[PDB]
Amino acid sequence: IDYGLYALEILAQYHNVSVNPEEIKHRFDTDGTGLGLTSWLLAAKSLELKVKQVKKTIDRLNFISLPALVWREDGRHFILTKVSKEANRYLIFDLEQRNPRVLEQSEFEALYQGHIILIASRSSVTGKLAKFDFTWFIPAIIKYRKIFIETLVVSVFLQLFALITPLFFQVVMDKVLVHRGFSTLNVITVALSVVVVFEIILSGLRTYIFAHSTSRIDVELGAKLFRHLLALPISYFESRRVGDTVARVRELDQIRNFLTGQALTSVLDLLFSFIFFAVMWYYSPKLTLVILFSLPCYAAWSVFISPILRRRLDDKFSRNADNQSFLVESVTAINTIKAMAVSPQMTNIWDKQLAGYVAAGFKVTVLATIGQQGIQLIQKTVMIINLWLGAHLVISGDLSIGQLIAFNMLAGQIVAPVIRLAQIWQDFQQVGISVTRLGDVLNSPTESYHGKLALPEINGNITFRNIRFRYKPDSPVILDNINLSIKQGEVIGIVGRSGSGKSTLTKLIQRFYIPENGQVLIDGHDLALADPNWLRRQVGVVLQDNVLLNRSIIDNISLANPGMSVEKVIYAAKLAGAHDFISELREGYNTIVGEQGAGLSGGQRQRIAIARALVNNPKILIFDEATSALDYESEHIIMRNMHKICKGRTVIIIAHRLSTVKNADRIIVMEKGKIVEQGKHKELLSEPESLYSYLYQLQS
């Protein structure tokens, strides 16, 4: 018995929030075998609570706000409440005995190890979703603000050392060579040595710390991106290609590559270069005005060049996404490519796409080179002007040779970050586009559910109320006015011709299809408002394709709960009539099936999927033409076991052959999206003019 879940339930009851233990276990107990401390804290944070584990002495135990949870290494936690003074007694809540009990000082000291969890109710009252832009990083900067202040301090100090080191050259030129010097030269040498070594150490530390923090920020962004991607509707994926979304996701790797680089440090160095300007103006304002006028030239050149580079990199990303889509589709469907002789066509398409991609990349490279050359031209022109003016100043007066050398080195240190940034212009614009692509993925609405309440478990009461459905916004109506009501524990057979609309009921019970008019109800709850995971985790559906994952047999069968026992897996495999073939294999239940079940036949993975659906305890079980892809002497075992599979469940069987639903409580016949007949088997076969009788005679 998991006691952390019970403790969370009790503490949520205390703080006036409703918690469903099954939903919390589904979300935060992915691998079974209990919750664990980290997942327990995450689950508590999910319920809009404020929790944190603290080290609290028994003496300090009197000043905390109870109730609080005492987390032990072994799963024997207990909730502490009402620490009583004047009697040194503790009114714990025993999670095993499920009732409060009164303890004294001694046994509490024996039972308390030094760690307690403090629980507070902090429910945020705010409903809104913000558009994903560059502003998403502002809360990240706020959260990681200690590190960034540290790096700002380090940058200021680095600028201080970089200001110091010109001055020693100036002093050498103006005193060591002018008069003489050997005593001062050694002092300057040792001071320069210590300055350069400490500058190197500080730069290394700054890079290390900044890279660490930006890596953590990127990890957070990636986690959020994957959560949102998995929370998206199926209509999002049905209208796209795999390669498009894959490329959108690898833009995250692009962002991570940018963040852990020299771009932001170079920007910091550029913004902290006004320290040098004070000394530059102190030397000669006539020379410093040149730099002050040169900076707007750099800004104007960058502003002029940037949008063209952005457009070119947009085209480059379009070609890259097309290449990724084509490559993924070609490798995924390599069996079809090889079975036919469509290799020349695929190579022609690849050659066209590759040529386009290389042309776009070359255009981007050309513009980057042009921008770099322009910035170099501006820098060199400024250097020439300063050389001429400094020559006049030194010949005339008010300037020395050492002062001129120091000013030249200071101007070089001013301009070096600009050159370093210009070398990575492509990265800047590529990140500007990566953020937009990640927004394109992240600005799509997820599967919406207004109800934040935790609905209870499902009884098999399904109700269709005036259901009207279309595949597309203007396609022909599939279901006109479907009205239906299915009670708990009832086996329902649904038959009809192909195109009658009986194939859309399975994806309507699940929230994959959105009815144009009407509402589908489970236990009287509208599915347009319920949390999709709650509905999906309690409904078992066996389709006609049934694709698997590239894992072993037992990992695919027990995918929904890896922590369950093997014996139940064997029982489920026996029910589906698949244990035998799995055993005939050399590795048995450890055989890897390959991509999409490549190592198994169609019927084999059909039976594997039947077992996978049966391994849990589905409140509602749907068979959407499951046994049609199977053969004889395998469907017979399926029926003999289905005699007891339907026990305690609401089972819906949608089949083409009328012999499959012969043993159902009701048989619902559909024709062109309307229910024409319903009843038992013989009650429907009594009328020879009915559609059911016609189909039965036709197939027989």
Ligand X SMILES: CCCCCCCC/C=C\CCCCCCCC(=O)O[C@H](COC(=O)CCCCCCCCCCCCCCC)COP(=O)(O)OCCN
Q: Which of residues 619-658 bind its own copies (CB under 8 A)?
A: 625, 628-629, 631-634, 656
**Cβ at position 88, least distance to its own copies in Å:** 44
At 473, give phi and psi (nearest 5°). Answer: -60, -30
Is 501 marked as a binding-site residue?
A: yes
Which of 15, 77, 525, 579 does the annotation list as catalytic? Answer: 77
Which positions ≥6 away from 169 have C-beta within 8 Å? 402, 405, 406, 409
**Tokens 């999670």, residue?**
95
Q: Which stretch binds its own copies (CB under 8 A): 106-114, 222-230, 300-308, 514-522?
A: 222-230
Q: Which is nearer to ligand X, 185 or 295 (CB)?
A: 295
* From 149, 197, 275, 300, residue interacting with ligand X (rule: CB under 6 A): 300
Q: Where are the beta strands (DSSP E) in 532-673?
A: 539-542, 620-624, 650-654, 666-671
Identify whether the C-beta of residue 470 lies closer than 8 Å to the C-beta of residue 501: no
Q: Is 355 exposed, middle or buried (0-12, 13-18, 19+ CB in 10 A)?
A: exposed
Q: What crossing angle do the helices spanning 242-259 and 285-332 adopt, rounded to 10°?
A: 150
* Structure token pair of residue 115: 């760690």
* From 333, 453, 529, 566, residue interacting with its own copies (rule: CB under 8 A): 333
Q: Does 144 bind ligand X (CB under 6 A)?
A: no
Nearest to 40 by CA among 8, 88, 63, 16: 8
Identify whether the C-beta of residue 305 lies closer than 8 Å to the C-beta of residue 374: yes
Cα–Cα separations (whole angstroms), residue 107 to 7, 89, 102, 310: 21, 10, 10, 70
Q: Choose the contact partner of 465 out of its own copies, ligand X, another protein, none; CB within 5 to 8 A by kind.
A: none
Q: Which stretch binds ligand X (CB under 6 A): 69-77, 123-131, 204-212, 434-442?
A: 204-212
Q: Choose the contact partner of 301 out of ligand X, its own copies, another protein, none; CB within 5 to 8 A by kind.
A: ligand X
Q: Does 388 bind its own copies (CB under 8 A)?
A: yes
Identify whether the C-beta of residue 478 lies closer than 8 Å to the C-beta of residue 501: yes
Q: Which stretch binds ligand X (CB under 6 A): 36-44, 212-220, 362-370, 463-471?
A: 362-370
Cα–Cα separations (whole angstroms), residue 177 to 7, 170, 171, 184, 185: 81, 11, 9, 11, 10
Instruction: Tell me how crowded residue 164 is: count the other CB atoms within 10 A of its CB.
Output: 14
Mapping DSSP to helix (H, G, I), strand (E, B) and coil, where does residue 400 land? Answer: coil
Q: Choose the contact partner of 192 out of ligand X, its own copies, another protein, none; CB within 5 to 8 A by kind.
A: its own copies
Q: Does 175 bind its own copies (CB under 8 A)?
A: no
Is 475 marked as a binding-site residue?
A: no
Q: Choose the contact partner of 360 out of ligand X, its own copies, another protein, none; CB within 5 to 8 A by kind.
A: another protein
Q: Which is nearer to ligand X, 205 or 278 (CB)?
A: 205
Identify whether the C-beta of residue 464 lies closer than 8 Å to the C-beta of residue 482: yes
**Cβ at position 118, least distance to its own copies in Å:** 26
Dihedral Cα 386, 388, 392, 393, nearest 10 deg: 10
**Cβ at position 610, least distance to another protein in Å:** 34
For residue 651, the cross-strand partners are: 621
d(CA 330, CA 603): 26
Q: Does 301 bind ligand X (CB under 6 A)?
A: yes
Q: Does 366 bind its own copies (CB under 8 A)?
A: yes
Q: Which is nearer to ligand X, 370 or 453 (CB)?
A: 370
CA angle 394, 398, 401 (to 5 degrees): 40
Nearest to 381 by CA among 463, 441, 301: 301
Q: Which of residues 553-582 bind ligand X (CB under 6 A)?
A: none
Q: Which is nearer to another protein, 76 or 212 (CB)?
A: 212
Is 330 marked as a binding-site residue?
A: no
d(CA 302, CA 120): 51
d(CA 559, CA 45): 26
Contact residues: another protein, CB under 8 A: 38-39, 41-42, 45, 134-135, 138-139, 142-144, 146-147, 150, 153-154, 157, 160-161, 187, 190-191, 194, 198, 201-202, 205-206, 208-209, 212-213, 215-216, 219-220, 222-223, 308, 311-312, 315, 351-352, 354-356, 358-360, 362-363
* From 208, 226, 274, 282, residue interacting with ligand X (rule: CB under 6 A): 208
Q: Which of residues 544-563 bind its own copies (CB under 8 A)?
A: 544-550, 559-560, 562
3-state SS, 327-394, equals: HHHHHHCHHHHHHCCCHHHHHHHHHHHHHHHHHHHHHHHHHHHHHHHHHHHHHHHHHHHHHHHHHHHH
- Binding letters toward its own copies, positions 578-617, x by CB under 8 A: ---x--xxx-------xxxxxx-xxx--------------
Is 444 marked as a binding-site residue?
A: no
Is 497 marked as a binding-site residue?
A: yes
* Structure token pair of residue 117: 């969890």
- Binding letters toward ligand X, positions 313-352, x by CB under 6 A: ----------------------------------------
**Cβ at position 570, least distance to another protein in Å:** 31
d(CA 103, CA 93): 10
Q: Which of residues 124-153 bind its own copies (CB under 8 A)?
A: none
Q: Which is nearer to ligand X, 300 or 598 (CB)?
A: 300
Is 155 marked as a binding-site residue?
A: no
* From 279, 297, 416, 639, residue interacting with ligand X (rule: CB under 6 A): 297
Q: Which of residues 369-398 bind ligand X (CB under 6 A)?
A: 369-370, 373-374, 377-378
Q: In what order do the strands lie in the sheet with 674-679?
A: 539-542, 620-624, 650-654, 492-496, 666-671, 674-679
Q: Choose the contact partner of 191 out of its own copies, another protein, ligand X, none; CB within 5 to 8 A by kind.
A: another protein
For residue 653, the cross-strand partners are: 493, 623
Q: Does 359 bind ligand X (CB under 6 A)?
A: no
Dihedral Cα 155, 156, 162, 163, nearest 10 deg: 160
Q: Does 260 bind its own copies (CB under 8 A)?
A: yes
Is 284 marked as a binding-site residue?
A: no
- The reply to whether 392 belongs to the active site is no
Q: Does 170 bind its own copies (CB under 8 A)?
A: no
* From 205, 242, 278, 358, residue interacting with ligand X (rule: CB under 6 A): 205
Active site residues: 77
Positions touching ligand X (CB under 6 A) are: 200-201, 204-205, 208, 297, 300-301, 366, 369-370, 373-374, 377-378
